[PDB]
C-alpha cells in the first residue's frame, strides 16, 4: 500500500517533540489548510530487506491498517499518512496532556477511585479493540495519553499501535515481544498469542495505578521476565494495606498464567470492582 508522497512540510508545520522511540519520533504539528493540530509520527523505513535498523514495510502497513479501522473516544484517530525515501509519517490525533506514565510520576499515589476512573476508560478502549479482534500487545502507562492533565478526572486515549495485530484465528504466532515489565507469560515463553495477553498487561497497569510499584520488576530484564513466567508477584502490605480486597481480587484474576483462565475484557467490565526490546 502506497502513501502520499508530497513533502509533508508543504502541508504541515512541526513543533515540540512529543516522544522519541527506537525507530520512531513523534512531533506536534499543525495542518496549514485548517489550523488543526496533530501528532506526526515519523517511522524510519528499512534500507535493505535483511536490515535490522528501521521498521519493515509489512510492520508499518499493519500499524496503518489497524489505525485506519479504529474510531472510539479512548483510542487515537489516524488523520493522514505520508511517506518519502526514509520515513512513513503518520498524522495522528494529538493527545496533549502527556503520558499516564508522567502523570503517575508527578503525583506519586492515586486513590482507588482515581485508579478506577483511569482503568474504566482503558477497559472501554480495549473492549472496543478486542471487539474488533485487535490485540494491542504493548499496553503500559507510557502508551496511555491524557487529553488534559489539569482536570480532576483526566480523559485518556490508547496510543502506539506498533505491535497491534488482528487475531482472526484466536491466536497469532509471529515475532511479538513488548516491554518486559508488562508482557504476559505467553509472550515470555514465545507461545501463540491472543487477546488474553492484553488482559494480563491490564492487571500489571492496575497494580501500578494502585501502589506506585511494579509487580514483576527485577533489577535486570531477564529477572523481570523470569518473574513474569513464574507469576512471581505479591501484594505488599506497605503499598496495599488501605486498598480494598475487591481491587486485589480484580488483579488476581488478570495475573493468571494460563490465558484461558484469565478474565476477558467482558469479564473485567462485569467484575464487581468495576460494574456500576526484551534483551540486555
Ligand atoms: N497521538 C499522540 N499524541 C501525543 N503524543 C504521542 C502520540 N503518539 C505517540 N506519542 C508520544 O510518542 C511516544 C512514542 O510513541 P510511538 O512512536 O507511537 O511508539 P513506538 O515508536 O514504540 O511505536 C509516546 O510514548 C508518546 O509520548
d(CA 19, ligand 1 centre) in Å: 5
Contact residues for 66 (Cβ-Cβ < 8 A; gap 6+): 134, 161, 164, 165, 166
Q: 135: left (phi > 0), else alpha (psi -120 to 50), else beta?
A: beta
Tell whether ligand 1 has an atom less than 6 A from the beta carbon of residue 95.
Answer: yes
Mutate to test the pocket of ligand 1, among 14, 30, 41 (most ligand atoms within 8 A of CB): 41
3-state secondary structure of 150: coil
Ligand 1, atom 23, residue with closest C-alpha = 162
Angle formed by the axes of helices 196-211 and 245-252, nearest 10°: 150
Q: How far apart are the first and last CA of the chain?
A: 35
- CB atoms < 10 A from the CB of 238, how many? 8
Half-sphere exposure of 231 (CA within 13 A, CB side): 13
138 a catalytic residue: yes
- CB atoms < 10 A from the CB of 216, how many? 23
d(CA 7, ligand 1 centre) in Å: 22
What domains can be seen in the chain, in order of their start residue?
Answer: 14-104 (3.30.200.20), 105-277 (1.10.510.10)
Q: Which three cell numbers stand for residue 132?
A: 474488533
d(CA 204, ligand 1 centre) in Å: 20
**Interatomic CA distance for residues 203 and 157, integer angstroms:** 18
* Number of separate helices (H) and strands (E) present in the chain: 9, 9
Resolution reading in Å = 1.5
Give the H/E segment covering residue 79.
strand 78-83
- CB atoms < 10 A from the CB of 49, how many? 7
**Interatomic CA distance for residues 30 and 71, integer angstroms:** 21
**Interatomic CA distance for residues 11 and 110, integer angstroms:** 42
Max CA pair span of the chain: 58
Q: Residues 138, 237, 249, 267: which is the catalytic one?
A: 138
Where are the alpha helices (H) located in the chain, listed in sequence order? Answer: 57-69, 100-107, 112-131, 185-188, 196-211, 221-229, 237-240, 245-252, 265-270
Amino acid at each position: 500500500t502506497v502513501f502520499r508522497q508530497e513533502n509533508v512540510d508543504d502541508y504541515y508545520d512541526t513543533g515540540e517533540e512529543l516522544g522519541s522511540g527506537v525507530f520512531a519520533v513523534v512531533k506536534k504539528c499543525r495542518e496549514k489548510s485548517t489550523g488543526l493540530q496533530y501528532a506526526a509520527k515519523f517511522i524510519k523505513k528499512r534500507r535493505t530487506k535483511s536490515s535490522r535498523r528501521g521498521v519493515s514495510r509489512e510492520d508499518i502497513e499493519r500499524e496503518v491498517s489497524i489505525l485506519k479501522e479504529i474510531q472510539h473516544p479512548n483510542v487515537i484517530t489516524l488523520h493522514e499518512v505520508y511517506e518519502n525515501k526514509t520515513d512513513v509519517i503518520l498524522i495522528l490525533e494529538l493527545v496533549a496532556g502527556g503520558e499516564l506514565f508522567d502523570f503517575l510520576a508527578e503525583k506519586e499515589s492515586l486513590t482507588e477511585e482515581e485508579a478506577t476512573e483511569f482503568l474504566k476508560q482503558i477497559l472501554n478502549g480495549v473492549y472496543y479493540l478486542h471487539s474488533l479482534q485487535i490485540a494491542h500487545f504493548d499496553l503500559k502507562p507510557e502508551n496511555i495519553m491524557l487529553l488534559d492533565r489539569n482536570v480532576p478526572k483526566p480523559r485518556i486515549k490508547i496510543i502506539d499501535f506498533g505491535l497491534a495485530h488482528k487475531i482472526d484465528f484466536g491466536n497469532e504466532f509471529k515475532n511479538i515481544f513488548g516491554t518486559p515489565e508488562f508482557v504476559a507469560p505467553e509472550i515470555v515463553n514465545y507461545e501463540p498469542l491472543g487477546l488474553e495477553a492484553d488482559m494480563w498487561s491490564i492487571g500489571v497497569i492496575t497494580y501500578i495505578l494502585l501502589s506506585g510499584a511494579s509487580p514483576f520488576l527485577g533489577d535486570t530484564k531477564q529477572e523481570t521476565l523470569a518473574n513474569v513466567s513464574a507469576v512471581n508477584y505479591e501484594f505488599e502490605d506497605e503499598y496495599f494495606s488501605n486498598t480494598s480486597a475487591l481491587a486485589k481480587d480484580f488483579i488476581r484474576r488478570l495475573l493468571v498464567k494460563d490465558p484461558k483462565k484469565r478474565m476477558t475484557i467482558q469479564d473485567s467490565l462485569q467484575h464487581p470492582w468495576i460494574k456500576p526490546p526484551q534483551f540486555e
